[PDB]
Amino acid sequence: NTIDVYPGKDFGDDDPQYQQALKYDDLIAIQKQPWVASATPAVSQNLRLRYNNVDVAASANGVSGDYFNVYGMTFSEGNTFNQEQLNGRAQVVVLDSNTRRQLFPHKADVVGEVILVGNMPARVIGVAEEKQSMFGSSKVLRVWLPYSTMSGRVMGQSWLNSITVRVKEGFDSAEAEQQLTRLLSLRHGKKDFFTWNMDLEHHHH
Question: CA end-to-end span of the chain, whole Å?
């Protein structure tokens, strides 16, 4: 009914070698299948975070900030983006627990710190805790900014977190998922991704 496609083998696989599994050309190929109503990517930008002498690759996502709820992430410090930050395109950032450890190993509190997100300074407004979330903790360094702040900023190189494929009404969704899987295995020469098929009504994330 809707089918998510994810890179790698298991939930939580965002290691470097999996980030490039799903291609824009794959999205376009899916989009042309006759059983597909629509197919949408979720995209991160890879950039570098700079704080003092730390300079590290990270994946940044622009989110709408009900985002943390729907994935089961809570905040160990600070909070999610408020309405003015979202409307105002504010230069503010939420850290994952890996990023927080990397940049601020010693600090008791990091809310109010400023980091460079690529070439854009951003005030840290919270730290998200991923360990009890749907997919567990990241294997890489993740940050989140307001979607509006990210839109039109070419902050770095994009990769596909996932592709969500809506199946046309009345089509057999198990067979759809099998066709999707054949299509992509053939384009890749292997099964380096996995799928999660569900009721549109349950796709709350």
Answer: 15
* Best CA proximity match to 11, nearest among 180, 205, 157: 205
Beta-strand pair 92-95/120-129: parallel
Nearest to 48 by CA among 100, 97, 115: 115
E strands present in the chain: 2-7, 36-51, 54-63, 74-78, 92-95, 114-117, 120-129, 142-146, 157-167, 193-198
Long-range contacts of 105-113 (CB under 8 A, 24+ apart): 109/77, 110/77, 111/77, 111/78, 113/51
Structural class in CATH, domain 2-42+159-198: alpha beta
- 44/180 Cα distance (integer angstroms): 23
Rounded Cα distance between 172 and 183, Å, is 16
- Could you tell me which of 63, 55, 60 has the C-alpha nearest to residue 157? 60
CA–CA gap between residue 6 and residue 160 (Å, rounded): 8
Q: Hey, where are the domains in the chain?
A: 2-42+159-198, 44-157
